[PDB]
Amino acid sequence: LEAQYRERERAETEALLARYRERAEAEAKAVREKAMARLDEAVALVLKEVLP
Amino acid sequence: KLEAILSQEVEAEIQALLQEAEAKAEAVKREAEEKAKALLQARERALEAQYRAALRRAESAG
């Protein structure tokens, strides 16, 4: 019983991780794509506070 | 007669014995069923523990 429950759990502790990876990477992209448009604005705020 | 006394003496012991020995063959059959039962109850408890722990581990990792 334990024998058919250990392999069960193994295949679920693979399924769970597999989905986490897909969100993680898509939400990694969502932090890239959000920045690269509001990118010149950051450089502006930085520049403006180094040169005084 | 003295012999009509004696046959009632065997038939008396040889029913007490056979009721005692079906009160051991009942008792054992009970205690063993309640044993067998509890050894799969304990099996139930183990499986939960090991699955609740495991899911948390794989969540924290992800």
Rounded to 10 deg, the angle between the B27-61 and A3-10 helix axes is 10
Contact A13 B58 (CB under 8 A): yes
**Specified resolution (Å):** 9.5
Contact between residue A9 and residue B51 where contact means Cβ atoms under 8 Å apart: yes
Distance CA B51, CA B60 (A): 14
Contact A9 B54 (CB under 8 A): yes
Distance CA B19, CA A47 (A): 102
Interface test with B, best of A16, A20, A27 (most B CBs within 10 A): A16
Structure-determination technique: cryo-EM
Dihedral angle, C-alpha B32, B33, B38, B40, nearest 10 °:
110
